[PDB]
């Protein structure tokens with residue numbers, strides 16, 4: 010979103026989007042899924058820690074590396090940059106590792122069904138199963154958990170360094186032009202406080218946002234292949250793709266209509282920060298001179314701070330009305346859609362469980378993003394502050 | 401935890417704890433649950449929005465008000481304070497509203513079983529149930545959701561004002577003694593940046609922490625009355641209270657052993673903040689004078705900042721190893737405990753579902769607290785900074 014990284018941001022992102030679309034179209038249905046080496050299609054290793062060593066996953070890794078390599082080799086000659094390696098390859102690696110973690114989560118999800126089957130068989134007929142099978146199954150689960158832990162730790166470490174690299178680039182570029190840039194009010198805050206909060210906020214709210222989109226993309230095909238049993242939606246009528254449209258619309262609206270409703274919030278934190286800077290400057294001048302910490306001026310500055318903060322707190326009531334209601338209704342959205350299908354007698358028990366489980370695991374990814382909306386507000390305010398400062 | 405609020409913190413908290421214990425003992429089993437007015441015991445209104453109007457809940461509200469009134473009337477004469485009303489009554493009200501929200505959540509939980517029963521009956525025999533019963537049930541759910549929304553909005557608003565009152569008290573008390581307190585390094589940051597972050601962090605991490613303890617206290621009796629079917633724990637032997645000890649130990653260790661493991665983390669953010677202050681001061685001096693923004697000094701300050709931040713990022717690997725592992729194993733802890741009971745053939749199907757559901761809803765409250773551990777680290781660092789500054 011900046012110019013310190015990202016060699017030419019005007020055309021870099023367009024090229025990234027176009028190339029991503031071309032590659033995805035080629036792989037998914039473009040007939041590019043032909044595997045001449047070894048037939049790993051229509052058959053995969055069962056649930057175990059070796060699931061990530063079969064030739065299918067190796068082929069996917071190779072394809073991803075080839076695509077990223079072509080893109081990077083184009084851009085490294087089209088337009089050189091000092092931070093090119095981080096700005097391109099680190100982003101690619103972060104996206105890849107997030108996808109890998111979603112896959113590991115799906116594997117843990119799949120491991121549950123046979124264990125429940127074994128438990129049910131033990132409860133019904135006990136002379137078939139012993140304790141050894143249980144210990145073996147727990148061993149397999151620990152095998153998956155170890156890989157999850159190992160990848161997650163390094164993911165966090167690399168994300169931290171990448172974000173700090175971004176902060177270094179921003180600070181260097183601002184301080185390069187400090188002479189004609191200090192005349193703006195609150196200049197000292199822009200380059201240090203704002204950059205720190207941007208780094209810390211993006212380290213926390215960036216991974217979560219990519220993870221939700223990845224979860225939706227991962228679970229979409231199951232709803233595509235399962236929406237043949239739901240022909241009607243409650244107050245819509247009859248659409249050809251029942252569950253996919255419902256899920257996409259629900260998630261997109263829950264993320265976007267809240268932003269539209271609370272569009273005025275990020276414009277208040279701005280003013281809040283300004284008044285606080287006007288406060289802090291005085292104290293910094295007062296830490297040496299004894300004549301600059303007089304009571305009345307401190308009184309006036311704190312009075313202004315209070316007056317702005319009260320208005321900010323006031324403008325959260327009509328946002329919380331929407332957010333809390335959306336959270337409350339979301340728990341039964343996946344069961345609301347099935348009223349006409351039950352009375353029509355089309356669906357059966359067990360398929361209801363599949364739909365409900367899928368919708369629940371989809372909701373789990375956006376729950377954390379919605380529950381922490383103050384951080385997004387702070388990030389958006391930081392974006393506006395830096396953008397206004399850049400001109 | 402301070403002296404600006406809380407008239408005499410040395411003896412106030414001890415009195416609060418003792419009085420809370422006395423009241424709880426009197427009500428729970430002290431025989432104080434006699435209701436001479438109307439017999440609401442051993443019978444309650446079914447699942448509806450009127451559940452919070454029966455004489456049982458009114459009696460509880462009256463008892464709570466009487467206890468808080470006695471305590472406040474004692475302290476308002478024992479030791480006067482300027483902020484007494486906020487410091488006592490606001491805390492009481494916040495705790496009460498959190499309990500109320502947990503109760504509403506329990507009601508929504510209970511509403512599920514009959515709806516599934518109706519759905520199953522519709523699936524088996526369709527000539528009994530029509531669409532009107534479904535619409536009525538959805539109406540009842542909306543009735544509960546409305547109360548949830550209305551209470552939550554005002555809860556957030558009041559918490560915001562109470563926290564800002566705390567910040568006002570702290571700032572007034574520090575600025576009262578500014579002359580002999582400015583000689584400490586980084587004084588300007590203590591009174592403005594640290595107070596702001598303390599307010600914003602406590603507004604977010606305070607409610608979540610109280611909510612988890614309230615959830616545990618609410619669900620404890622069910623495990624007390626249900627642990628008669630589990631006589632053995634996996635590698636423990638035979639204890640008289642199976643599930644209660646397991647739940648309490650699991651939650652307490654997951655919250656506390658992580659803190660013990662990462663005890664060294666809060667001591668690093670301190671230094672981080674110091675170096676950043678040493679940076680910002682220079683820029684604030686440079687916003688007017690043109691001879692104080694020389695490149696080399698900025699270089700040295702940023703070099704120090706980078707050197708400290710790298711060490712901080714390094715010390716998260718061995719903390720994430722524990723945190724991610726704890727999150728990963730927690731998903732199957734409630735099913736691990738039941739291996740000996742299944743092979744012993746004591747428990748039956750359906751009771752397993754109850755145990756698993758209870759443990760899942762207990763885990764849901766601590767999941768949000770564990771997933772956001774950076775905020776707790778920041779809060780603890782703020783506490784240490786202010787405590788060191790106060791002496």
Ligand SMILES: CCCCCCCC/C=C/CCCCCCCC(=O)O[C@H](COC(=O)CCCCCCCCCCCCCCC)COP(=O)(O)OC[C@@H](O)CO
Pocket residue numbers: 022023025026028029032033036037065066069072073076077080097100101104108226
């Ligand atoms: C202003 C607009 C800005 C837009 C910015 C964003 C632009 C767009 C983002 C793209 C990143 C994500 C790419 C992948 C998206 C799709 C996600 C995904 O999982 O796709 C897989 C296929 O992917 C594929 O073949 C696709 C391969 C794509 C390879 C990479 C190409 C783009 C490189 C970009 C470099 C960084 C650029 C700068 C970013 C900021 C599906 O596999 P599938 O389930 O069948 O299982 C196969 C096997 O493992 C057996 O299960």
Ligand SMILES: CCCCCCCC/C=C/CCCCCCCC(=O)O[C@H](COC(=O)CCCCCCCCCCCCCCC)COP(=O)(O)OC[C@@H](O)CO
Pocket residue numbers: 413414416417419420423424427428456457460463464467468471488491492495499617
């Ligand atoms: C250094 C140490 C510091 C320690 C600081 C903390 C000190 C301790 C905290 C206490 C707050 C919470 C009190 C309540 C704790 C127990 C929580 C609770 O829900 O207790 C209920 C009974 O409570 C009761 O009778 C108890 C009534 C207690 C009334 C209030 C007394 C204390 C007032 C304090 C004022 C603020 C002081 C300063 C705090 C910072 C159970 O009902 P029950 O499920 O049977 O359903 C009945 C009916 O509704 C039908 O279901």
